[PDB]
Enzyme design. Structure first.
Site, PDB file in Angstrom:
ATOM      1  N   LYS A 271      -7.607  -4.340  -3.602  1.00 32.98           N
ATOM      2  CA  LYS A 271      -7.244  -4.407  -2.190  1.00 32.98           C
ATOM      3  C   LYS A 271      -6.543  -3.097  -1.838  1.00 32.98           C
ATOM      4  CE  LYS A 271      -4.947  -7.135   1.404  1.00 32.98           C
ATOM      5  NZ  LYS A 271      -3.870  -8.119   1.703  1.00 32.98           N
TER       6      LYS A 271
ATOM      7  N   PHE B 243      -0.329 -11.297   8.061  1.00 37.88           N
ATOM      8  CA  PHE B 243       0.741 -10.305   8.131  1.00 37.88           C
ATOM      9  C   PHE B 243       0.149  -9.190   8.990  1.00 37.88           C
ATOM     10  CE2 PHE B 243       4.647  -8.385   6.587  1.00 37.88           C
ATOM     11  CZ  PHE B 243       4.439  -7.036   6.850  1.00 37.88           C
TER      12      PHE B 243
END
Lengths: 125, 125
Positions: free
Chosen positions: A41, A120
């Site tokens: 990621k 988020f």
């Protein structure tokens, strides 16, 4: 004989180095939280605050999400966070990350019943 | 099948740990910089900015020192620093410290010619 200025540098200066710069926190956590299974990621943020305090953000200041869509909320106060950034490129597998601990207000998107954090959105500044 | 709420927790929450709390930065630097000889220096702060930026503080905001006496100056900007504090119970010669990285304005006392930092007075909380 150590000069007064010299003592200051010995006791208080460590330019370019920090607990974050040599930390393997992001390497370990990005792997532990399954963010290095399919691919490394790119970027991720971890929040070091009690869960109820992050969840409470859903009932604080309502702000527009970064992409303008969804329901985002900004924290009443700055929170302890750590930014993890994949470094040196690729190499998925080896997922190498730069760790950066800091304190910032955060913005999260909430949804559901109960109304809780599901995304988020960003740290402010 | 993973709910969005659960995914948020997995990806972004880490309530009981952080780069700083798991860091041996202070344990190593306090010793490497001579602040654990004879006794364990109780508290200390390291600044991670280039030396010239810290030295330049002597020409920034003149303020009354917070913890000592002399000519103090507060940085116009916040700086990356690290607080090292003895854990409770630590016992000489192996000094154990809690590492705490953060960004804060700092206050240093200056003197001499060139006018340079000789004491770290405090960080502005």
């Amino acid at each position: 004989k150590e000069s007064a200025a010299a003592k200051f540098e010995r006791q208080h200066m460590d330019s370019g180095n920090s607990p974050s710069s040599s930390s393997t926190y992001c390497n370990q956590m990005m792997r532990r939280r399954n963010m290095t299974q399919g691919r490394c990621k790119p970027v991720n943020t971890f929040v070091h605050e009690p869960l109820v305090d992050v969840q409470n953000v859903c009932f604080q200041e309502k702000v527009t999400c970064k992409n303008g869509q969804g329901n985002c909320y900004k924290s009443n106060s700055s929170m302890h966070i750590t930014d993890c950034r994949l470094t040196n490129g690729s190499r998925y597998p080896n997922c190498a990350y730069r760790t950066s601990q800091k304190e910032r207000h955060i913005i999260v998107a909430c949804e559901g019943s109960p109304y809780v954090p599901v995304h988020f959105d960003a740290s402010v500044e």
